[model samples]
Target: STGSATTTPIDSLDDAYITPVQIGTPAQTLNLDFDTGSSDLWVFSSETTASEVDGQTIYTPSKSTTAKLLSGATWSISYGDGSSSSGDVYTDTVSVGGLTVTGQAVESAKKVSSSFTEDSTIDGLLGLAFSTLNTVSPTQQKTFFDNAKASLDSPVFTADLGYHAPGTYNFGFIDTTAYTGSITYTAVSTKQGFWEWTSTGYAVGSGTFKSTSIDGIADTGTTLLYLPATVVSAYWAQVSGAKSSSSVGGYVFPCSATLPSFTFGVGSARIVIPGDYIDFGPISTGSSSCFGGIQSSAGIGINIFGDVALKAAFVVFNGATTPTLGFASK
Candidate 1:
């Protein structure tokens, strides 16, 4: 249900899938992707076809005494990019923090081809974003948030990223104990389902632009951050001679001593990006001159700020009561 600039329920995974921590349990040694785009928690099953399991991690339900399949529950997911997944539904007891929800629907993909499986960095996905895109059961109304909402301390869940190595994304209310700054709480429109937010501007280095901003949506399903051309251009303007270099997919700046600092405006708040995040991963490691951020858009003028852009702030997806959102500094 995560929407785009002009609409809700855009089906964008912007705030859809994220990482989850396995604790105390025997599978504590495993990592899973939390999908907010759909109301199902599933992994690649061992019985999956060879082609379907091509680049995916296979999970053996037989190994876990607590696993249960949904019998005839069937599901299929289609992406904006023409990629999709179809599989049988499964049921299991899923826990987030101290709260545990039993009989939760999970879609074990038998076929899927996306960056998710090949990346090797992302495990399974966590879906706390919305319920409108539920793939579990069309007739049965159920969602992860729907089941766990009443029990959460604040009936609120947050995915705060700022951890050094894809770890530290907290759920069940934002921890105010982490900082002294107050959270910039905003009301949400629930006509659709997921949480949709407004963007004031995008920042890179020391420069900040307001006139050129896009309707920023938070998606966990997406892997990278995308910016509108207007915002991306203004961002590149500050880098002296920064531009798109065919070498990489995003914007790139010349290798200079004075790399700039960037920030974007959300109402009156500014989300700051440290210099390290500004440059590409390989180059930042002292390898090549890969681009830092962006200055261009895909076919559409719309932009998508991926997980990389979200690593700086404390983000919350409140769906306990209808749908809502809350943001603050980490």
Candidate 2:
């Protein structure tokens, strides 16, 4: 069977893509961010403190007659940004779009970092990465994708993210109309518990493509693209009035500057990201400085192809026994 869902960007910045989810017996609807960078289906729940709830919706498993506690289960996860959430666990019915799964591990947040509480647009996150990254202690749990893969007509899913608009996520089968041209297949390295892939190289604007191999992960949860400092520096150099700002925390450019497009090679295919996406908007509401969408991965160690790049292509997460990824330009 096939399942499909609409992904809506929370803000004009495309900070995160949210999908409506149905959980519990009577179908408690909650918007969840579908993240490819981490593996943990966690949500704001009754287990969370009142002070921490803010304006976010809470998932009270008690309200669901089918909710079952997983004895001795606990989960704690932290993001690269230092934000975190720790929770207790429950098994319940989880339905997204037209797909439903029973006994799905639903981590109920007992504690959440201030960053999460401050962001009321996101009620929870549904992980799409490998289940090996699941945070449940003692016994790891499978992700929603992993749990539903067995019954899917095809053990695969596709991400078609948009810039400041709605996108589509399809499971089990690829929608021919979702993209243009054929998809380019690539090898995946699950060693890091991500959709990690190595690109042949990159090109800044119309410059010649570099032949170096750059390794990075496809992270839907992340908002920007990060690359090697040398590569990032080369791109920034092409823009006038561009510099790394300590206050801004990344490369910032004049709001009126003409930015160059970024393109990365996958096998023989070159997917280009238009400069408009790189503008990233002004640093502050009234500020004249604009932050560059592509930044350095020096501190991160691993390059990240976040929404900035994903918005430029249709990505497929193939989950056969041996995993592989596919990319197509549309």
Candidate 3:
């Protein structure tokens, strides 16, 4: 069996993709945000503070006959977007796309930050990064894919993230038909527990492609693309009415402004981000101002190729011995 699952978009927001997975004996199904940038399968559960949970469905361990507590074990995670969740741990049966993993570590959130609580759409996060990044205390936890990989025909997964459209995520095997053209392969450096790679350079509009290297992580959980301050400034400058607004944060422009398409270099292959995607959307509906999707990766030290950039290409996150990234036109 391929042990693959189909991932669907949450809504028009295009911020994240959610996968449905069952946990425990009787199975408590939850919509999870599969994040390749972090490692920790944390969920809102019975242990969550009632006051902190808005409209999310919580996983109840006691109701699951196969659930077991990991004595004195706990986990806490904070995301770059300021969202956070923390709780005790449990060992239970977890199944995704018919691939079941026994004795899987599930972090049941007892407390969550406002950013998470207010966003009632996602019930939890399924970390797809290396197990070393897991936040479990004393011992790190492995991701669902890692636990199920040994039995899979091929230890691989592909992310087909659509732009304001429905896309799919496949595990264990890559469906050749999902993408067009040959996949451009790039060696990945997982020393940082992320799909980090170096881009040859980038170009704004149809201009020349710079040879400068852009180092960053491909993060699906993040919404906007983050690059160096100078790089971001250069791209926005091409827009007639674009300006970095301190009040609005990041770059903003008139809704009616024309935007140039941005292209990124990967070796000899070029991954282009259309101008429509760069405009993001209005600062608020019915407003004349729009936010720039590309921002600075300052303070974070590392650049991030978030959903805005990932959606522009078909991404294959290879989990084999020499983990690599394959990108192609979707």
Best by lDDT: 2
lDDT of 3 by residue, 1-330 (tens): 455566677766676788888998899999899898999999999899999899988899999999999999989899987778899999999988877899999999999998778878889999988898999998877898889889887888788888878777777888889888889999899899999999889999988888898999988888889999999989998998889888987899889998898888877898999988776778888899988888888858899999889989989899999999989887
Off by over 4 Å in 3: none
Q: How accurate is candidate 3 locally (lDDT)?
A: 0.87
Tens digits of lDDT, candidate 2, 1-330: 778999999988888889999999988988999999999999999999879988888899999999999999999999988999998999999998899989999999999999999999899999999999999998999999998999999999999999778999888999989899999999999998999999999999999998889999999999999999999999999999999987779999999998899999999999999999898888989888999999999999899999999999999999998899899998
List of clashing residue pairs for candidate 3: none
Candidate 3, 267: how far from true, in Å? 1.5
User: Cα lDDT of all candidates, in order?
Assistant: 0.56, 0.93, 0.87
Segments of candidate 1 deviating more than 4 angstroms: 1-29, 37-39, 51-57, 63-66, 80-83, 114-117, 137-141, 190-193, 202-204, 208-213, 245-248, 255-258, 282-287, 295-302, 320-322
State TM-scores per candidate: 0.78, 0.99, 0.96
Global Cα RMSD, each model: 6.6, 0.8, 1.4
Clashes per candidate (backbone, < 3 Å): 34, 0, 0
Candidate 1 residues 213-258, lDDT tens each? 4654566555455676666676667667667656565677766635
